[PDB]
Amino acid sequence: PSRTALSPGVLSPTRPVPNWIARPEYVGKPAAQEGSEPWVQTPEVIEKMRVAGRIAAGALAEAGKAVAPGVTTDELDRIAHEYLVDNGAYPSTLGYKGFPKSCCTSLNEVICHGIPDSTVITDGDIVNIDVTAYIGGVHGDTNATFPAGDVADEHRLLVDRTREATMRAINTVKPGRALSVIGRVIESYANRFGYNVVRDFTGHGIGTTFHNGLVVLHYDQPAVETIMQPGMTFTIEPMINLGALDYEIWDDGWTVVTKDRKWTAQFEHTLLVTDTGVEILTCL
Numbered sequence: 001p002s003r004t005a006l007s008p009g010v011l012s013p014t015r016p017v018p019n020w021i022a023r024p025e026y027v028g029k030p031a032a033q034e035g036s037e038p039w040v041q042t043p044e045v046i047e048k049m050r051v052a053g054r055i056a057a058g059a060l061a062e063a064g065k066a067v068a069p070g071v072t073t074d075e076l077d078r079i080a081h082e083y084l085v086d087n088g089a090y091p092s093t094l095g096y097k098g099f100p101k102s103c104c105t106s107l108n109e110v111i112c113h114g115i116p117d118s119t120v121i122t123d124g125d126i127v128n129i130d131v132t133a134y135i136g137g138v139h140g141d142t143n144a145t146f147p148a149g150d151v152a153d154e155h156r157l158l159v160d161r162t163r164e165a166t167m168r169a170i171n172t173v174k175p176g177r178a179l180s181v182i183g184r185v186i187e188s189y190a191n192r193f194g195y196n197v198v199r200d201f202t203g204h205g206i207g208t209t210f211h212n213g214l215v216v217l218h219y220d221q222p223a224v225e226t227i228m229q230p231g232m233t234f235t236i237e238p239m240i241n242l243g244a245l246d247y248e249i250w251d252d253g254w255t256v257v258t259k260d261r262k263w264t265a266q267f268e269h270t271l272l273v274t275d276t277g278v279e280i281l282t283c284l
């Protein structure tokens with residue numbers, strides 16, 4: 001047996017960031033200045049995005065190595081926070097629209113945007129950790145779902161097939177292809193197993209802003225006319241549900257849970273379209 005439905009816990013105090021680490025503009029504001037930026041980046045921005053992506057990937061991998069029964073989601077956030085700050089990076093989630101932590105931790109039926117707290121991971125859980133770094137005036141965003149202890153076959157397979165969907169989508173990225181191929185590939189692959197691909201949450205362009213106004217759908221919708229071009233940078237971050245797509249948001253305003261409490265899995269990378277194909281910016 002796996003655990004039953006989650007409830008929110010208590011947050012630790014806000015984690016500080018040394019003042020020499022520049023903040024994104026939206027920290028200490030209610031909204032963010034984003035959504036109207038160009039989608040193709042300049043070579044100088046891309047170079048800085050490789051640095052931000054590698055730091056985010058290191059923070060994700062170090063917090064993922066900690067995932068085990070008995071560990072809290074707050075302890076994962078401490079590891080991610082300290083990794084970013086030791087690397088001179090600001091955690092992009094911290095203070096975005098008042099989000100109180102440095103990464104998102106989404107167990108089990110939480111589709112996304114779970115808030116690190118006193119929740120104890122236990123055997124059988126699947127734990128998504130989502131970390132974004134802001135350094136050099138740019139962002140790098142990545143996430144992965146990690147098993148804790150011996151995960152039930154249905155849940156294990158959900159995670160492994162969501163990772164495979166994500167990688168198949170990434171491997172479609174090439175200049176001249178329609179962006180809509182990403183969602184066509186993910187949803188065709190997920191529908192082999194009877195899973196439902198989340199529609200209301202999406203990938204996005206990313207650069208000097210976190211969510212730059214480019215939207216990447218993870219379901220099939222061939223009427224989008226956007227083409228991938230060299231220098232475009234965006235995330236692929238599909239959420240895939242065992243159950244229905246209906247969802248609820250907790251009173252914290254962030255945590256999104258499936259209404260049927262069936263589990264859900266996600267993986268994410270920040271990608272660059274190159275002249276011949278794709279480059280994963282959020283790799284070690």
Ligand SMILES: CO[C@@H](C(=O)NCC(N)=O)[C@H](O)[C@@H](O)[C@H](O)/C=C/C(C)(C)C
Binds near residue numbers: 099237
């Ligand atoms: C699904 O989540 C993505 C997203 O909201 N996409 C756009 C959308 N409207 O669906 C998001 O970019 C995550 O990858 C990111 O790590 C988290 C950021 C905050 C919690 C600070 C917002």
Ligand SMILES: [Mn+2]
Binds near residue numbers: 130237268
């Ligand atoms: Mn993310």
Ligand SMILES: [Mn+2]
Binds near residue numbers: 203237
């Ligand atoms: Mn993202």
